[PDB]
Amino acid sequence: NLSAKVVQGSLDSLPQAVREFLENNAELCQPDHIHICDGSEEENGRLLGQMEEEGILRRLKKYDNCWLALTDPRDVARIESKTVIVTQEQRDTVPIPKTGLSQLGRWMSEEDFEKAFNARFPGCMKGRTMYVIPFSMGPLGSPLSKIGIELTDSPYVVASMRIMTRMGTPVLEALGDGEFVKCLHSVGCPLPLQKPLVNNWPCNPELTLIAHLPDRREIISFGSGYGGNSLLGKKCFALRMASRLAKEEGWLAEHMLVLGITNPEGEKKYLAAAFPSACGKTNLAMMNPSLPGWKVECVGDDIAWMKFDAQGHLRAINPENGFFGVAPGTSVKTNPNAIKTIQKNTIFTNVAETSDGGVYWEGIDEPLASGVTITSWKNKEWSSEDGEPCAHPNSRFCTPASQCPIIDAAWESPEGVPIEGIIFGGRRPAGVPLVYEALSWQHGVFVGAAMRSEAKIIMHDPFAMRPFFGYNFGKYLAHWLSMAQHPAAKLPKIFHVNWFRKDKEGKFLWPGFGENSRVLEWMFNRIDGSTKLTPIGYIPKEDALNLKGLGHINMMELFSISKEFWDKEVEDIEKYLVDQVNADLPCEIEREILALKQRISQM
Numbered sequence: 001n002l003s004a005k006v007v008q009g010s011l012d013s014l015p016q017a018v019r020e021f022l023e024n025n026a027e028l029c030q031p032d033h034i035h036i037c038d039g040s041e042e043e044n045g046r047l048l049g050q051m052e053e054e055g056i057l058r059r060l061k062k063y064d065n066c067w068l069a070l071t072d073p074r075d076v077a078r079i080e081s082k083t084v085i086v087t088q089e090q091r092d093t094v095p096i097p098k099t100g101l102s103q104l105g106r107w108m109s110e111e112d113f114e115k116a117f118n119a120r121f122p123g124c125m126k127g128r129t130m131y132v133i134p135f136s137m138g139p140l141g142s143p144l145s146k147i148g149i150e151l152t153d154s155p156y157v158v159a160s161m162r163i164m165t166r167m168g169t170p171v172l173e174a175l176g177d178g179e180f181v182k183c184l185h186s187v188g189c190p191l192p193l194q195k196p197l198v199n200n201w202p203c204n205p206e207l208t209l210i211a212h213l214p215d216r217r218e219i220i221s222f223g224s225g226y227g228g229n230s231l232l233g234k235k236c237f238a239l240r241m242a243s244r245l246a247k248e249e250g251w252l253a254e255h256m257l258v259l260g261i262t263n264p265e266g267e268k269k270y271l272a273a274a275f276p277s278a279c280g281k282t283n284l285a286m287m288n289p290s291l292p293g294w295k296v297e298c299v300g301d302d303i304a305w306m307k308f309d310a311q312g313h314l315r316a317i318n319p320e321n322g323f324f325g326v327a328p329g330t331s332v333k334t335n336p337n338a339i340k341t342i343q344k345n346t347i348f349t350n351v352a353e354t355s356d357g358g359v360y361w362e363g364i365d366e367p368l369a370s371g372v373t374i375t376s377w378k379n380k381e382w383s384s385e386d387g388e389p390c391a392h393p394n395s396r397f398c399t400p401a402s403q404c405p406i407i408d409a410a411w412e413s414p415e416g417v418p419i420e421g422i423i424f425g426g427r428r429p430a431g432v433p434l435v436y437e438a439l440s441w442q443h444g445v446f447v448g449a450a451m452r453s454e455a456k457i458i459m460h461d462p463f464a465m466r467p468f469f470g471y472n473f474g475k476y477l478a479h480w481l482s483m484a485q486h487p488a489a490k491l492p493k494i495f496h497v498n499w500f501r502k503d504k505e506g507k508f509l510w511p512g513f514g515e516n517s518r519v520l521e522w523m524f525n526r527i528d529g530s531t532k533l534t535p536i537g538y539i540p541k542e543d544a545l546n547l548k549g550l551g552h553i554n555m556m557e558l559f560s561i562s563k564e565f566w567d568k569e570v571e572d573i574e575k576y577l578v579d580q581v582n583a584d585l586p587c588e589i590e591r592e593i594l595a596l597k598q599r600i601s602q603m
């Protein structure tokens, strides 16, 4: 039977529910063969070899075991509009807005999703191998860890999951007969190929659909090989699906980096931060701090799962096993710890390649040796005179977290690390000071709710979760507010930052990167108990921020809070929240809108 198609592993070695899931989907998708992944190095080398032979990956000979994938340019990013959550009731998924369409997610009915599924998956893996990836989100064991099984027809997804999650036989052994999240993925190009293949990279942009069915604990993704769409444990499972589980179960799943910072007297605090795409999470999470005697260590750079412990501390774990980082802009100067991490055992996707088999991208800040030339991510000889970047702007590296030279010693502790501060922020060229602190938990929640970031357009992205809410955002806001009624809660201090304020010539007012350690110092000491009151929150008192070692900073413009700007600001925040959240907007947030307007009117 099915057994005849198994080219690695044994159906009999699978827990029955895992076997049933495989059986059902192999019948449906009709793969030519089945490969049960073991997660071993030998399997990995095997799959990289096969991918090299097929044109899927090229070896980057400048490094130890690094590889490059070039994709079809139509498949290079998440597609929000093609990403949906399916529930019986729309309101469980997104609030019904007052006007317009929701910008807080995209719901699809059970009925409509069945019709989409049936138009896509039957026979989709014909001519291909279906891989079975058992994976753990969180340390193989932890109270806070969840397991999934991802079936995929993409060896690129396999090797990337090996890095981004704990994967293989040991997870199946830990899972036993427990529950798991059912993850089904196909690139959507059964053989014989019906359309042209670009760069040997199969995709089906026209039918691409990334679906989440929380009541069935299933994630079903079709048409795209790109990481956000195909690495189902990460955005789909560890943010979307998990956020809903978290609300139902008394925990949180957030688009937050977690770092541990130590001062020159040995006192160490963990901080979590939510920033949208392009706003600097990875840079902060593995910061090399400029301030002497301080240290930063990385727990995670993208996703945090957080739950109150028995003494009321909000404990975080990083459910990922690796870093899926934006490559362009990464340099020894801007993120030397990232450059160090990616020197070996790394898969890059859509970056440029030098003639000595090195990588390259905008902002790498590394002059080429004599005679060395660049091949762009489109496989063309490239020069800076061509009018297009050598690397796609959202090109990535996918690298083992264990390789970060400052990876925190508790990054895999099953008890998690206690969060003392939560930081929000984004790109705001005007009006928003470098840093401010919320006035209370409810105000902090409002600060998160109110986030906006420049992407020439400025968009709302509350809690940096806009594309990732697994359920109604008004109920997510209520869930966060409810933390303040948790018995003996030790609530983290909330801050909002802006590394990106500009002067009138568009130049940054703050140098950023490692110098952001000065901002962290301020937060660290605020957590320990000074401040200047303003209508938007506390800012540092005059001279409180440590500027020793910097050239001149225009502190007055950087911390400027204009009534005109903020009148406009709160008017925009009100309109957005009342319109988009509507009947689901918690009263506490209403009070905060009004309270800020009241405070601003007094200036």
Ligand SMILES: Nc1nc2c(ncn2[C@@H]2O[C@H](COP(=O)(O)OP(=O)(O)CP(=O)(O)O)[C@@H](O)[C@H]2O)c(=O)[nH]1
Pocket (backbone or CB within 6 Å): 275, 276, 277, 278, 279, 280, 281, 282, 283, 284, 302, 324, 325, 326, 328, 329, 330, 334, 363, 499, 500, 508, 511, 512, 513, 516
């Ligand atoms: N001016 C300035 N630019 C910064 C700072 N931090 C990061 N950047 C720029 O922001 C860009 C993106 O940074 P990155 O660390 O990848 O952001 P991210 O939040 O990790 C993105 P994703 O969630 O997809 O991984 C990079 O080009 C980086 O150089 C900073 O303090 N100042």
Ligand SMILES: [Mn+2]
Pocket (backbone or CB within 6 Å): 281, 282, 301, 302, 324, 325, 326
């Ligand atoms: Mn990142």
Ligand SMILES: [Mn+2]
Pocket (backbone or CB within 6 Å): 255, 277, 302
């Ligand atoms: Mn992210």
